[PDB]
Amino acid sequence: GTREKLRKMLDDLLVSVDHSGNIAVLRTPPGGAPFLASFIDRVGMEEVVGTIAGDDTVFVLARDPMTGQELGEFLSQRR
Amino acid sequence: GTREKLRKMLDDLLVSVDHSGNIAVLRTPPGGAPFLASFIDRVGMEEVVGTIAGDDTVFVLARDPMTGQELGEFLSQRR
Amino acid sequence: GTREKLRKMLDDLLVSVDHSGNIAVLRTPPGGAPFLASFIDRVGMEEVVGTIAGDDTVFVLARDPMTGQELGEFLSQRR
Amino acid sequence: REKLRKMLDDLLVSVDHSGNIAVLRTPPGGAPFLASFIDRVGMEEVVGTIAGDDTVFVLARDPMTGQELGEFLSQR
Amino acid sequence: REKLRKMLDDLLVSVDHSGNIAVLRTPPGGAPFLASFIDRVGMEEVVGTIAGDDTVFVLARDPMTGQELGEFLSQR
Amino acid sequence: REKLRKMLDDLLVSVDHSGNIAVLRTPPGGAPFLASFIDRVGMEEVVGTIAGDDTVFVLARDPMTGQELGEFLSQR
Ligand SMILES: N[C@@H](Cc1ccc(O)cc1)C(=O)O
Ligand SMILES: N[C@@H](Cc1ccc(O)cc1)C(=O)O
Ligand SMILES: N[C@@H](Cc1ccc(O)cc1)C(=O)O
Ligand SMILES: N[C@@H](Cc1ccc(O)cc1)C(=O)O
Ligand SMILES: N[C@@H](Cc1ccc(O)cc1)C(=O)O
Ligand SMILES: N[C@@H](Cc1ccc(O)cc1)C(=O)O
Ligand code: NA
Ligand code: NA
Ligand code: NA
Ligand code: NA
Numbered sequence: 014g015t016r017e018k019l020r021k022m023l024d025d026l027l028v029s030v031d032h033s034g035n036i037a038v039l040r041t042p043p044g045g046a047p048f049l050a051s052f053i054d055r056v057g058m059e060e061v062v063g064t065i066a067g068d069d070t071v072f073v074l075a076r077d078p079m080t081g082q083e084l085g086e087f088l089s090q091r092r
Numbered sequence: 093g094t095r096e097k098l099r100k101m102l103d104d105l106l107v108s109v110d111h112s113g114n115i116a117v118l119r120t121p122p123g124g125a126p127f128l129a130s131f132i133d134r135v136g137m138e139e140v141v142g143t144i145a146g147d148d149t150v151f152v153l154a155r156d157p158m159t160g161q162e163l164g165e166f167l168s169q170r171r
Numbered sequence: 172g173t174r175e176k177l178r179k180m181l182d183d184l185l186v187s188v189d190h191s192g193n194i195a196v197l198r199t200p201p202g203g204a205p206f207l208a209s210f211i212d213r214v215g216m217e218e219v220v221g222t223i224a225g226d227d228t229v230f231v232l233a234r235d236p237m238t239g240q241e242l243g244e245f246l247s248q249r250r
Numbered sequence: 251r252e253k254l255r256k257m258l259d260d261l262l263v264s265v266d267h268s269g270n271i272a273v274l275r276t277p278p279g280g281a282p283f284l285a286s287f288i289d290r291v292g293m294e295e296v297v298g299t300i301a302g303d304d305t306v307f308v309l310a311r312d313p314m315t316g317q318e319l320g321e322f323l324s325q326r
Numbered sequence: 327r328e329k330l331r332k333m334l335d336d337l338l339v340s341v342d343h344s345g346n347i348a349v350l351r352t353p354p355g356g357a358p359f360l361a362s363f364i365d366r367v368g369m370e371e372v373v374g375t376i377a378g379d380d381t382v383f384v385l386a387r388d389p390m391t392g393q394e395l396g397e398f399l400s401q402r
Numbered sequence: 403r404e405k406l407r408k409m410l411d412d413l414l415v416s417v418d419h420s421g422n423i424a425v426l427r428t429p430p431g432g433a434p435f436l437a438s439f440i441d442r443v444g445m446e447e448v449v450g451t452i453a454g455d456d457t458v459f460v461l462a463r464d465p466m467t468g469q470e471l472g473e474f475l476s477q478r
Contacts, residue, residue, distance in 0.1 A: 025336075026359075031220045033232050034193045035113045038221040044362035044455070046223075047147065047355030047379060048337075054149075062110045063117040065125075065146040067223040068205065068358060068431070068455055070212075072151065072230065074112050104260075105283075114192045123286035123379070126226065126279030126303060127261075133228075141189045142196040144204075144225040147282060147355070147379055151230065153191050183412075184435075202303070202438035205431030205455060206413075226279070226303055226434060266449045268461045269422045270345045273450035282379060289381075297342045298349035300378040300459075302452040303434060305441075307376075307383065307459065309344045346421045358455060365457075373418045374425035376454040383452075383459065385420045 015056055016091075022052050023092045028069075030089055032081030037088070039071035046071045053088075060084055094135055095170075101131050102171045107148075109168055111160030116167070118150035125150045132167075139163055173214055174249075180210050181250045186227075188247055190239030195246070197229035204229045211246075218242055255326045257287050265320040272320035274306035281306045288323075295319060331402045333363050341396040348396035350382035357382045364399075371395060407478045409439050417472040424472035426458035433458045440475075447471060 026049040031038040041049050046066035053064055053073065061084065062074040075084040105128040110117040120128050125145035132143055132152065140163065141153040154163040184207040189196040199207050204224035211222055211231065219242065220232040233242040261284045266273040276284050285301035288308065296319070297309040310319040337360045342349040352360050361377035364384065372395070373385040386395040413436045418425040428436050437453035440460065448471070449461040462471040 033220045033235050035115070036193070036220075036232055038232055040221065042359070042362075043366075044358030044360070044377065047357075048353070048359040049355075050146065051353075051355035062112045062115075063119065063149045063151070065144055065149050065151050065223055066355065067146075067208065067225075070221045070223050072221070072223050072232070074115055074117055074151070077112050114194070121283070121286075122290075123282030123284070123301065126281075127277070127283040128279075129225065130277075130279035141191045141194075142198065142228045142230070144223055144228050144230050145279065146225075153194055153196055153230070156191050200435070200438075201442075202434030202436070202453065205433075206429070206435040207431075209429075209431035224431065268449045268464050270347075271422075271449075271461055273461060275450065285378065297344045297347075298351065298381045298383065300376050300381055300383050300452050302378075302437065302454075305450045305452055307450065307452050307461070309347055309349060309383070312344050346423075361454065373420045373423075374427065374457045374459065376452050376457055376459050378454075385423055385425060385459070388420050 019052070019056055019091050022049060023088060027088070027092065030085040032085045035075045035077070035081055037073040037075060037081040037085040039073060039088075041069045041071065043069050045069060060087065098131070098135055098170050101128060102167060106167070106171065109164040111164045114154045114156070114160055116152040116154060116160040116164040118152060118167075120148045120150065122148050124148060139166065177210070177214055177249050180207060181246060185246070185250065188243040190243045193233045193235070193239055195231040195233060195239040195243040197231060197246075199227045199229065201227050203227060218245065251291070251326065254287065254291055257284060258323060258326055262323070265324045267316035267320045270310045270312065270316050272308040272310060272316040272323060274308060274323065276304050276306070278304050280304060327367070327402065330363065330367055333360060334399060334402055338399070341400045343392035343396045346386045346388065346392050348384040348386060348392040348399060350384060350399065352380050352382070354380050356380060403443070403478065406439065406443055409436060410475060410478055414475070417476045419468035419472045422462045422464065422468050424460040424462060424468040424475060426460060426475065428456050428458070430456050432456060
């Protein structure tokens with residue numbers, strides 16, 4: 014199921030969540046950011062305009078009017 | 093010519109445009125984001141502070157006071 | 172020392188600094204963005220929510236209430 | 251294979267080889283765009299591809315050589 | 327090696343080889359996650375790893391083959 | 403070649419090899435910084451480079467070996 018893989022994906026890859034403005038910042042272990050962010054893309058979050066992954070960090074762009082914090086809180090509750 | 097390659101680059105790589113705040117979000121096919129964003133860099137958009145590409149997503153930072161939307165609308169009109 | 176490597180890292184990799192909103196934009200030579208941004212991560216800037224590197228560009232997310240500009244000015248003074 | 255042909259025309263700056271690897275050079279940032287499409291084709295002789303920024307390493311399946319794999323890509 | 331075993335179970339879609347290279351295929355974006363962990367293990371026979379997006383090239387140390395290195399990874 | 407020499411001093415943590423590949427290890431995120439500069443040099447014996455995060459695969463042109471290509475880079 015998708016909710017279960019989202020839960021396990023976040024359980025295993027989300028080291029921390031942070032935010033500023035319209036951006037939620039996801040911290041992963043090394044190399045984990047593209048792995049996590051690709052999955053987030055594919056679960057189809059309406060509040061998520063898009064994501065970009067580097068190596069251990071993902072920037073999640075919140076759809077207006079939702080904030081980075083509120084977006085990050087959503088994802089944390091999926092854990 | 094540069095306008096023609098910008099037009100064809102956007103025609104072939106820009107799956108969709110979105111925006112939030114000062115960020116225009118470009119969606120590409122798989123692997124296309126660095127290809128597209130590098131070219132955007134090199135055409136020298138004054139309104140563009142910079143770009144970062146992941147795999148299929150580019151975040152374009154709009155130069156103040158222009159918005160992500162207005163930046164995205166500019167690029168769409170180049171199509 | 173860390174301040175010295177931050178100084179030399181910035182001296183050799185920071186082509187330019189820019190900003191918009193809460194994002195400081197770092198420009199590097201080709202391939203230099205992950206090299207620079209990883210180091211910035213590891214020096215532990217409280218004002219820095221996180222960073223993402225592409226190839227020659229880094230987006231540094233400023234911790235509220237600090238701005239991208241103020242964040243970029245901090246880093247420039249480390250040069 | 252009509253789509254791969256346009257993909258190579260627009261992205262393949264050069265093809266080289268050594269041993270069992272064919273190397274593709276692209277314009278900047280083009281490597282994962284080209285290489286992911288090659289994966290999608292799914293050729294039996296391609297063990298795998300790695301994309302950097304403007305270079306793709308394509309591993310040829312033994313006993314095919316990287317020179318042979320590069321010639322097929324250069325053909326298309 | 328208990329952590330690598332879970333890492334491979336969750337990320338290793340397939341393993342292939344040619345010459346002295348073992349190729350790991352992962353779900354999308356999984357390659358640098360898997361490959362950095364492999365580096366961390368630090369096996370003597372692994373000369374190095376490169377991660378793309380969903381493919382990892384693992385270079386086997388002579389005289390070990392990529393087939394042999396892939397079998398050890400497939401084992402775990 | 404004076405710039406490559408400083409580039410290697412600051413970024414080359416180690417050099418290894420297997421078959422026709424020289425492997426460069428860098429500090430974290432250093433691989434595309436080093437590798438793009440190597441491309442820029444444009445050595446005839448370098449068929450191509452791929453950068454991951456901290457590892458660069460440099461493919462040696464036959465009949466040169468990756469050991470030989472790594473020794474030249476280690477020299478500089
Ligand atoms: N955190 C930044 C910088 C970074 C780059 C490479 C690394 O290996 C680690 C960190 C990113 O993920 O893009
Ligand atoms: N869209 C994000 C996450 C992603 C990563 C890897 C992919 O293959 C696909 C998507 C990015 O481009 O960074
Ligand atoms: N500046 C953008 C786009 C880019 C991608 C690849 C390049 O080689 C150059 C530029 C980034 O660093 O992500
Ligand atoms: N050609 C190598 C090195 C490189 C890295 C980054 C670049 O922008 C350019 C070249 C690769 O694509 O991995
Ligand atoms: N399999 C290759 C090509 C690729 C690039 C980007 C992708 O999203 C998917 C595949 C790699 O991982 O480098
Ligand atoms: N050494 C491999 C795997 C790796 C990936 C990401 C890292 O942050 C570290 C290592 C590479 O650079 O591709
Ligand atoms: Na890392
Ligand atoms: Na990136
Ligand atoms: Na993709
Ligand atoms: Na570049």
